[PDB]
């Protein structure tokens, strides 16, 4: 077959029948910058709800694999690491979700962003769902753009847990997040807290503060979405050990030295396109976050996902992770 394997040696060292089963939501973020999170030194509370969640760990020194969704998302789930990663061949490689699925962890991917950028392609199509349209997402009529919202991806998840009751499960929610350039469209009116707001496509012609304000209002909506994802997990914490991982795919330039948007090649790109937020929450000490200021990259995601399910694989031994 065409697949290039990397973890045929992978084994789950404790089974869900020998301990509490585990239920994890991985929010795959979009366009959020580390330096616009107050936990990392920003001067506005852009994540006020997460700031009040007990057990929410922040990671202040995370760098993305790349500067675009197409480059970063496959690398986030890769075994190869940023040094060997090749965007053009990523789809042929066994990735961490392929491994976990083979080992019996339920894999679900809901997408309100674009698609999985090849990550889900080898797995059954019934495990991938497009949440960008109102035919699948029930929450698209809350704004004048008729734009489907990330919180719609929480609806019906209890069916998945019930269908896989007693097993380990990993649910990816690929959110619209801070996708630009129309940051002002990314949030409903209750999050229009920082004003005034850039509403034009020529971002350089907006007042800089108005551009920042639109971007930060979109972060408030993501704060809300992540908090609601934690609320959902808590409804299952009697029977499951639950956890939420959030990592953004890349950052965004907002006019520094006249640069806007993202996508600059890694060798040239400014720090704002690479420094990304990451958060981890869990309900108890089954999982323990790594020290908040540990220097980490997207290479830490695959080892984190394996460790969350007690899976060992030689390819990622000694790699740092977001949990101990
Ligand atoms: Br302010
Ligand atoms: Zn992106």
For every residue of 183-235, DSSP letters joined together read: GGGGS-GGG--S-S---SS-GGGS-HHHHHHHHHHHHHHHHHHHHHHHHHHHT
Beta bridge partners of 109: 128, 172
What is the stated resolution of the deposited model, in angstroms? 1.2
CA 20 / ligand 2 centre spacing (Å): 35
Q: Collect all residues with Cβ–Cβ distance below 8 Å to 33 and sequence separation of at least 6.
A: 248, 251, 252, 254, 272, 275, 276, 277
CA 252 / ligand 2 centre spacing (Å): 9
Q: Is 250 annotated as a binding residue?
A: yes
Distance CA 49, CA 220 (A): 9
What's phi and psi for 58, nearest 5 deg? -105, 150
Q: How was this structure determined?
A: X-ray
CA 19 / ligand 2 centre spacing (Å): 37
* Closest ligand relative to 251 C-alpha: 2
CA 123 / ligand 1 centre spacing (Å): 45
- Coil, helix or strand for 54? coil
Task: Identify whether 196 is preceded by a cis peptide bond (ω within 30 of 0).
Answer: yes
Distance from the Cα of residue 61 to its chain's centroid: 16
CA 310 / ligand 2 centre spacing (Å): 30
By C-alpha distance, which of 281, 194, 273, 183 is closest to 234? 281
Domains delineated in the chain: 1-324 (3.40.720.10)
Distance CA 45, CA 246 (A): 18
* Contact in structure between 79 and 94 (CB atoms under 8 Å): yes
CA distances from 66 to 77, 115, 178 (A): 13, 17, 16
* Contact in structure between 228 and 281 (CB atoms under 8 Å): no
The alpha carbon dihedral of 95, 99, 100, 101 has a sign of: positive
CA angle 166, 311, 125 (to 5 degrees): 65
What letter would DSSP give residue 96? H
Maximal CA-CA distance, the chain: 60
CA 309 / ligand 1 centre spacing (Å): 41
């Amino acid at each position: 077959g065409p697949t290039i394997y990397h973890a045929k040696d992978a084994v789950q060292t404790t089974k869900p029948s020998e301990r509490k089963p585990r239920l994890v939501v991985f929010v795959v973020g979009e366009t959020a910058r580390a330096d616009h999170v107050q936990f990392n030194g920003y001067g506005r509370e852009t994540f006020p709800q997460l700031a009040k969640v007990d057990g929410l760990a922040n990671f202040s020194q995370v760098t993305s694999c790349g500067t675009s969704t197409a480059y970063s998302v496959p690398c986030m789930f890769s075994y190869l690491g940023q040094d060997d990663y090749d965007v053009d061949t990523a789809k042929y490689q066994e990735n961490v979700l392929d491994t976990l699925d083979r080992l019996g962890v339920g894999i679900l991917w809901r997408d309100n962003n674009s698609d999985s950028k090849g990550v889900m392609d080898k797995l059954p199509a019934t495990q991938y769902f497009d949440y960008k349209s109102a035919t699948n997402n029930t929450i698209c009529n809350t704004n004048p753009y008729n734009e489907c919202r990330d919180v719609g991806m929480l609806v019906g998840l209890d069916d998945y847990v019930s269908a896989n009751n007693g097993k380990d499960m990993l649910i990816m929610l690929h959110q619209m997040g801070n996708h630009g350039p129309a940051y002002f469209k990314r949030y409903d009116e209750q999050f229009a807290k920082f004003t005034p707001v850039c509403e034009g496509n020529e971002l350089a012609k907006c007042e800089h503060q108005s551009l920042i304000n639109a971007y930060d209002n979109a972060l408030l909506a993501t704060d809300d979405f992540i908090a609601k994802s934690i609320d959902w997990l808590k409804t299952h914490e009697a029977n499951y050990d639950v956890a939420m991982l959030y990592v953004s795919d890349h950052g965004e330039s907002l006019g520094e030295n006249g640069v806007y948007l993202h996508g600059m090649p890694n060798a040239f790109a400014p720090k704002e396109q690479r420094a990304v937020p990451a958060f981890f929450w869990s309900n108890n000490t089954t999982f323990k976050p790594t020290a908040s200021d540990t220097v980490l990259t997207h290479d830490a995601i695959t080892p984190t996902l394996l460790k969350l399910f007690d899976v060992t694989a030689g390819k990622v031994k000694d790699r740092a992770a977001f949990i101990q």
